[PDB]
């Protein structure tokens, strides 16, 4: 395998960057992420979140209350992806105009 | 859709970014790409090459000869993704090497 392939396993796909984009503007529960992302199933969303947590890119916050409450936030390490996120957004802006 | 989503529509599909990566070395026909990406199916590769062409990031070169042959190259527009690729690898290298 290659570095590119290896890195894509962490931040590739059509969902992770969208999730991170949403989290750059604040912590969110899975239900909020699901609402904001109609093209993804709950199952796939949960799987994407578990991978991102595993990779140390987002932190899972569990509020010990009833009903249950779980929120996700970009970790300190995850913030190091902001530069790439900005580039993707800039490229997308130009593309839409194309 | 958001700006990030627009970009992922073009490069988020499975294998798309790797394909573009391989094409940064030069034009190649489907057979070669198959050898470089031993895990992609013929149908999937065909599907992705078509989407990449439609989004304008790669150009397909048709050789009207005997035997007929077709190659793919990174379009000038596709070249504008090299910077994102550079940062992705830079980030991935820092990630894997812990």
UniProtKB/Swiss-Prot annotation, chains A, B:
According to the entry, every stretch annotated as the HTH hxlR-type domain falls at 4-98
Instruction: Please tell me whether the keyword DNA-binding is annotated for this protein.
Output: yes
| Highest taxon listed in the record's lineage | Bacteria
- What are the UniProt keywords, alphabetically? DNA-binding, Transcription, Transcription regulation
Q: Where are the annotated coiled coils located?
A: none
What GO annotations for molecular function exist for this entry? Answer: DNA binding
Name of the protein described by the UniProt record = Uncharacterized HTH-type transcriptional regulator YtcD
Protein's organism: Bacillus subtilis (strain 168)
